Design an enzyme around this catalytic site. Structure first.
Site, PDB file in Angstrom:
ATOM      1  NE  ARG A  46      14.086  35.703   1.855  1.00 11.16           N
ATOM      2  CZ  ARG A  46      13.998  36.357   0.694  1.00 11.16           C
ATOM      3  NH1 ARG A  46      13.091  37.317   0.500  1.00 11.16           N
ATOM      4  NH2 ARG A  46      14.828  36.039  -0.299  1.00 11.16           N
ATOM      5  N   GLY A  47      16.742  32.459   5.882  1.00 14.31           N
ATOM      6  CA  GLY A  47      18.145  32.103   6.119  1.00 14.31           C
ATOM      7  C   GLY A  47      18.760  31.665   4.800  1.00 14.31           C
ATOM      8  CE1 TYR A  49      23.924  26.290   3.798  1.00 19.70           C
ATOM      9  CE2 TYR A  49      23.698  27.684   5.757  1.00 19.70           C
ATOM     10  CZ  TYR A  49      24.489  27.130   4.761  1.00 19.70           C
ATOM     11  OH  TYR A  49      25.834  27.425   4.739  1.00 19.70           O
ATOM     12  CB  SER A  50      16.078  27.349   6.783  1.00 20.15           C
ATOM     13  OG  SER A  50      16.705  28.387   7.517  1.00 20.15           O
ATOM     14  CD  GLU A  51      11.717  28.534   1.648  1.00 21.81           C
ATOM     15  OE1 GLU A  51      11.016  27.574   2.036  1.00 21.81           O
ATOM     16  OE2 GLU A  51      12.058  28.683   0.454  1.00 21.81           O
ATOM     17  CG  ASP A 155      26.110  30.257  12.577  1.00 21.63           C
ATOM     18  OD1 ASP A 155      26.861  31.216  12.317  1.00 21.63           O
ATOM     19  OD2 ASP A 155      24.984  30.186  12.054  1.00 21.63           O
TER      20      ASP A 155
HETATM   21 BR1  LIG Z   1      13.577  33.243  12.947  1.00 21.85          BR
HETATM   22  C1  LIG Z   1      14.281  31.496  13.224  1.00 21.85           C
HETATM   23  C2  LIG Z   1      13.784  30.655  14.247  1.00 21.85           C
HETATM   24 BR2  LIG Z   1      12.393  31.253  15.400  1.00 21.85          BR
HETATM   25  C3  LIG Z   1      14.322  29.364  14.415  1.00 21.85           C
HETATM   26 BR3  LIG Z   1      13.655  28.216  15.790  1.00 21.85          BR
HETATM   27  C4  LIG Z   1      15.353  28.929  13.557  1.00 21.85           C
HETATM   28  N1  LIG Z   1      16.065  27.769  13.469  1.00 21.85           N
HETATM   29  N2  LIG Z   1      16.939  27.882  12.473  1.00 21.85           N
HETATM   30  N3  LIG Z   1      16.816  29.077  11.900  1.00 21.85           N
HETATM   31  C5  LIG Z   1      15.837  29.764  12.553  1.00 21.85           C
HETATM   32  C6  LIG Z   1      15.307  31.047  12.385  1.00 21.85           C
HETATM   33 BR4  LIG Z   1      15.956  32.179  11.006  1.00 21.85          BR
END
Ligand SMILES: Brc1c(Br)c(Br)c2[nH]nnc2c1Br
Ligand SMILES: [Cl-]
Length: 333
Positions: A46-47, A49-51, A155
């Site tokens: 998880r992030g 902005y993103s799964e 980052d």
């Molecule tokens: Br875990 C993962 C992986 Br593997 C990648 Br490739 C990504 N790119 N942006 N964020 C990411 C994350 Br969290």
């Protein structure tokens, strides 16, 4: 009066000499693929902005990583895409394989060529002296490349470095904060994670450059060689600078404020205090002395500078004595 302008020491005008299309990401037209070409296998992370998921490409049974973007302005999505397309095939840069939308939800996703879910934070506190130098040199290849290509990552941290330690192989990931360098452009300072934020971000100096990534690199390096995670351990963005000040000293901090005529937020008046520049020996102890050498400290010292212009460039870093045995072993192989 106003803050004094700054320019990058290297790769200053590289975007200017490119066609507009290279850097004008807002005008980029994406051809969105079909996410039903991929089937999601399992969650990787998880992030904000993103799964992130492991998936299979049905067409050829190849394993991939799908980064499903949580909703955000179309502008930011095009920036990441364009940067990824510009850097594709570059040394140790993650490879964008495809760009897709789920047909029902219409949610955008980026598809990357598969790399192990083992981020650098998971093992950078347990490496040997040689391996730290090896993996640092590999990260530097990525940074010199993206900087040479007119892009700053913004980052750089252990989580954004994917390592396949079995194969001595490394990818710099998550370019969603990266941006094109343009001389005279004033950038957003709410970037990077607290512990890796360069002083420019913390004092609100907006006209920064590639050298930002080199501060973050220094933070990583110091964490690894001193076995101290993080190295600069602030409670918040104000205390972060105080943590830096207690190591780098307040004298060079204020000289830096004065050189660029920075208006310092008055919250800092009371908290920065006055501190000497500390010798690095102060962080050496029995559990880390094997990772610490004169070469390591000399290199680290030249990354961790308040004045962004004073920091080594990625290429200069790659030529420091710290990496001589890595470079020699690379030519051999
Ligand atoms: Br875990 C993962 C992986 Br593997 C990648 Br490739 C990504 N790119 N942006 N964020 C990411 C994350 Br969290
Ligand atoms: Cl991290």
């Amino acid at each position: 009066s106003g803050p004094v302008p700054s320019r990058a020491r290297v790769y200053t005008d590289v975007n200017t000499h490119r066609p507009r299309e290279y850097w004008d990401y807002e005008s980029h037209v994406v051809e969105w693929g079909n996410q039903d070409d991929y089937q999601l296998v399992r969650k990787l992370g998880r992030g904000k902005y993103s799964e992130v998921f492991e998936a299979i490409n049905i067409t050829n049974n190849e394993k991939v990583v799908v980064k499903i973007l949580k909703p955000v302005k179309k502008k930011k999505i095009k920036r990441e895409i364009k940067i990824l397309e510009n850097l594709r095939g570059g040394p140790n840069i993650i490879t964008l394989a495809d760009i897709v939308k789920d047909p029902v939800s219409r949610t955008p996703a980026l598809v990357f060529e598969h790399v192990n879910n083992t981020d650098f934070k998971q093992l950078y506190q347990t490496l040997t002296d040689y391996d730290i130098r090896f993996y640092m040199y590999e990260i530097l290849k990525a940074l010199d490349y993206c900087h040479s290509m007119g892009i700053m990552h913004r980052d750089v941290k252990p989580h954004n470095v994917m390592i396949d330690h079995e194969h001595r192989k490394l990818r710099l990931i998550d370019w969603g904060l990266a941006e094109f360098y343009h001389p005279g452009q004033e950038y957003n300072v709410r970037v990077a994670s607290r512990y890796f934020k360069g002083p420019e971000l913390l004092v609100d100096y907006q006209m920064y450059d590639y050298s930002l990534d080199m501060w973050s690199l220094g933070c990583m390096l110091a964490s690894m060689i001193f076995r101290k995670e993080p190295f600069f351990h602030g409670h918040d963005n104000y205390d972060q600078l105080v943590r830096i000040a207690k190591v780098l000293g307040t004298e060079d901090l204020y000289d830096y404020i004065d050189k660029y005529n920075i208006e310092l937020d008055p919250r800092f008046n009371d908290i920065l205090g006055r501190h000497s520049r500390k010798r690095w020996e102060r962080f050496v102890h029995s559990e880390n002395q094997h990772l610490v050498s004169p070469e390591a400290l000399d290199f680290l010292d030249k990354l961790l500078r308040y004045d962004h212009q004073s920091r080594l460039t990625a290429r200069e870093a790659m030529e420091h004595p710290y990496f001589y045995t890595v470079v020699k072993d690379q030519a051999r192989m």
